[PDB]
């Protein structure tokens, strides 16, 4: 039902300029903040930018801010990225959200080539186990968080998805063997017996307070 339908990556010449699409369907999009995620080639993800219903409010990642405008036109169901003066440093492939600081639903990713915050911490790193295993990974933040807490899973090549949020949660359509608890400063997601379609990157992030920040992820291989 939920779609997020991404357009306009490509390869750009440093100084460059290029403007990413983002159509939404499936649910009231004038209701609900926006935001756009990117993930540089074999690293994490990053917040980097976000509006509000109406486009009143809007925030972006310091690295962007000044070069990169996100805008919206509620009457076409679309999202924006205009990005100028691109740099190296902006290659990666672009996610837009939907809503402000739960990621509930992600666009597939459009990949962009140019050729005092809250630490999140995840432990382990990565980890290899066998199916039908007990995984446990454990995310920290560097200050309180109350349950402002939420888990992604992100299968390589695709996109990620919400698991669990505010903590303990479990997103609608997870499997039940995915399951969230912890508290304050301290978070673990575990799978209970580990299917073959689990391996994949797994990711934390706080949902309290700006910017947005993500553990840096936990890889499960088999």
């Known amino acids: 039902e939920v779609q997020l339908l991404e357009s306009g990556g490509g390869l750009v010449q440093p100084g460059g300029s290029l403007r990413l699409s983002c159509a939404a369907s499936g649910f009231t999009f004038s209701s609900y903040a926006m935001s756009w995620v990117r993930q540089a080639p074999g690293k994490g993800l990053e917040w980097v930018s976000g509006i509000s219903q109406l486009g009143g409010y809007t925030g972006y990642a310091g690295s962007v801010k000044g070069r990169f405008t996100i805008s919206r036109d509620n009457s076409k169901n679309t999202l924006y990225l205009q990005m100028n003066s691109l740099r190296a440093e902006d290659t990666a492939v672009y996610y837009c959200?939907?809503?402000?600081?739960?990621?509930?639903?992600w666009g597939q990713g459009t990949l962009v080539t140019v050729s005092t915050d809250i630490q999140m911490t995840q432990s382990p790193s990565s980890l290899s186990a066998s199916v039908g295993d007990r995984v446990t990974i454990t995310c920290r933040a560097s200050q309180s968080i109350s349950s402002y807490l939420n888990w992604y899973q992100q299968k390589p090549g695709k996109a990620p998805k919400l698991l669990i949020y505010?903590?303990?949660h479990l997103q609608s359509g997870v499997p039940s063997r995915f399951s969230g608890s912890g508290s304050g400063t301290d978070f673990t997601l575990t799978i209970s017996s580990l299917q073959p379609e689990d391996f994949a990157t797994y990711y934390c992030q706080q949902s309290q307070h700006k910017p947005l920040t993500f553990g840096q992820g936990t890889k499960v291989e088999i």
């Open positions: 959200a939907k809503n402000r600081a739960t990621f509930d639903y």
């Open positions: 505010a903590a303990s």
